[PDB]
Amino acid sequence: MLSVAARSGPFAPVLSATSRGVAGALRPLLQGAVPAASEPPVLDVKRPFLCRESLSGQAAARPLVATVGLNVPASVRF
Amino acid sequence: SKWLDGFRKWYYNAAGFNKLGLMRDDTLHETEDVKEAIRRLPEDLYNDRMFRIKRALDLTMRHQILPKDQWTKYEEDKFYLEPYLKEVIRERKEREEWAKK
């Protein structure tokens, strides 16, 4: 009884991930399907930070505040 | 008047869209403002309208009509698309006036 299936009764298919690399002779129960998950929007790539002088100033020291506007860009201040 | 309601009911029966189960707001032509009104319709009204149009198309394919008791009548011909369509017309007239300015 040195195994997850022989110890956890209903938690065996939860603790054990089974992958059929080759399709079996018998059909499997609960085949499942991906219901067309959405894609996050494509945005501009934020710059990386490689030197400490340009790294300074980006550690937050104030409460988070958001700002939207009719004709001004939505900014966030830290 | 009392004469006007009876004449309107007779003309409504002569129109013939009640015999296929339609309503007036169903039978009005789908222009741009009408399309905006249907987009602004709630889900239940949109589903009932879509089923009514589909059943009407099936009936006209079969060259038949609904039975007499199942025809819609003048008193319960609800005008569901009327406020949405009126608001779309008002907004389009506002945009037209701003374009005129």
């Binding site: 996050p40 929007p41 945005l43 501009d44 934020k46 990386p48 930070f49 490689l50 030197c51 400490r52 002088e53 340009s54 790294l55 300074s56 100033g57 980006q58 550690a59 937050a60 020291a61 104030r62 409460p63 988070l64 505040v65 958001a66 700002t67 939207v68 506007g69 009719l70 004709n71 001004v72 939505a74 966030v76 830290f78 | 987009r39 602004r40 709630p42 907004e91 506002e94 945009r95 701003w98």
Partner: protein, 420 residues
């Protein structure tokens, strides 16, 4: 009256503050205590949808009318939202401040919230959240509040991904009818007459109920979460409870924040006076950014250290910063450094006030918080009245307090809270 600020309070609880400085640009702000604090688990993101729905069709002006009229004036309409409060700010020429105030109060007091409009706007909610989370500090601060509080401040300032597609116009109307009430708003103005301000106050804002729903007092919980996302730098915020807005303890905590380093004053500098940066740079050879995070609210505060470092050196940076704050709590400090911190705080507050946008924001925040004007001279007086013993007490309170940690990055060497 350019010499002072005219200040009145209506019998329904509304606050009216005005200053006639004869500025070419006139500003009108409406400050409401209707932030993300006042949401329970059932209507999360309603504040975000309201903030993005501040340009919809209203009972008095359509969305097309609002947009075209405001951009024909050329003035600006904006919403600035915190956890505590929202601010609806309009600015424009003095000749068109009347119609700008009409648009502002039409979009605040009576929005229709048509369901097709919010159905089209929830995609804009998703896009705005993505743009806000383009940088990682927003995510770190949101996670920090979420693990610091049980309720009323753990609510995210941005709409959850599941709640996108679920926020209804009924929920928006419920939120507005329960929180957009007269006793919790303040209508402030720069370059406008107090008579005009009070006239439009009783012309629009007279028909709202009262105090409305209170809140949930924001109980503290502590704990930690760690988002491993494989980023090139590791962000880590370790905070604890502090005082609320309106306390000498909160003033001491702000002085302590500026003593440990609230950020750089010099572009591309070494930050030679900030004790956190000095202590980290004593034993590091990597890029880093360490600062004192401070965020007070109406009933609770958060004070701690924010560190951005490399993946391998994150533990060393966090330990050095924590040992520096531990030394401050033990009492390793000088009165000259405390005076320099107070001078930094005075300069920062005065530079916040010097801009008319910041001045309007401070006026509205003070009107919502205390219901009275505290002059900058008196603010600097109490800032100077902060003592260094209270700074040591605040540092000891942060050291001894229960910890909340939000970390993100590649955390193979980032320590845990029990290891600190």
């Amino acid at each position: 009256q350019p010499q002072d600020l005219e200040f009145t309070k209506l019998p329904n609880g509304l606050v009216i503050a005005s200053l006639e400085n004869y500025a070419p640009l006139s500003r009108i702000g409406l400050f409401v205590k209707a932030g993300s604090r006042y949401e329970d688990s059932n209507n999360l993101g309603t504040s975000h949808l309201l903030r993005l729905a501040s340009s919809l069709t209203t009972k008095g002006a359509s969305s097309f009318k609002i947009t075209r009229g405001i951009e024909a004036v050329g003035g600006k309409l904006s919403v600035t939202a915190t956890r505590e409060n929202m601010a609806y700010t309009v600015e424009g020429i003095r000749s068109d401040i009347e119609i700008l105030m009409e648009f502002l109060l039409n979009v605040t007091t009576a929005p229709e919230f048509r369901r097709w409009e919010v159905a089209a706007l929830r995609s804009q909610l998703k896009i705005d959240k993505a743009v806000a989370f383009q940088n990682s500090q927003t995510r770190i601060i949101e996670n920090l509040h979420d693990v610091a509080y049980k309720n009323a401040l753990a609510n995210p300032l941005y709409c959850p991904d599941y709640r996108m597609g679920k926020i209804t116009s009924e929920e928006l109307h419920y939120f507005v009818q329960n929180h957009f009430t007269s006793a919790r708003m303040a209508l402030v103005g720069l370059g406008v007459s107090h008579s005009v301000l009070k006239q439009v106050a009783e012309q629009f804002l007279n028909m709202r109920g009262g105090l409305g729903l209170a809140g949930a007092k924001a109980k503290y919980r502590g704990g930690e979460i760690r988002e491993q996302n494989g980023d090139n730098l590791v962000h880590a915020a370790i905070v604890a409870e502090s005082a609320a807005i309106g306390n000498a303890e909160a003033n001491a905590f702000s002085v302590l924040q500026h003593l440990l380093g609230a950020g750089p004053h010099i572009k591309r500098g070494n930050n030679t006076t900030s004790l956190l940066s000095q202590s980290v740079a004593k034993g590091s050879h990597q890029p880093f950014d360490v600062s004192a995070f401070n965020a007070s609210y109406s009933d609770s505060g958060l004070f701690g250290i924010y560190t951005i470092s490399q993946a391998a050196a994150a533990g060393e940076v966090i330990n050095a910063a924590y040992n520096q704050v531990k030394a401050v709590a033990q009492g390793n400090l000088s009165s000259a450094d405390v005076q320099a911190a107070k001078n930094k705080l005075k300069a920062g507050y005065l530079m916040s006030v010097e801009t008319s946008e910041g001045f309007l924001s401070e006026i509205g925040s003070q009107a919502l918080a205390a219901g009275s004007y505290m002059p900058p001279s008196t603010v600097l007086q109490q800032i100077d009245s902060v003592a260094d013993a209270d700074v040591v007490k605040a540092a000891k309170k942060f050291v001894s307090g229960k910890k909340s940690m939000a970390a993100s990055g590649n955390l193979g060497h980032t320590p845990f809270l029990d290891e600190l």
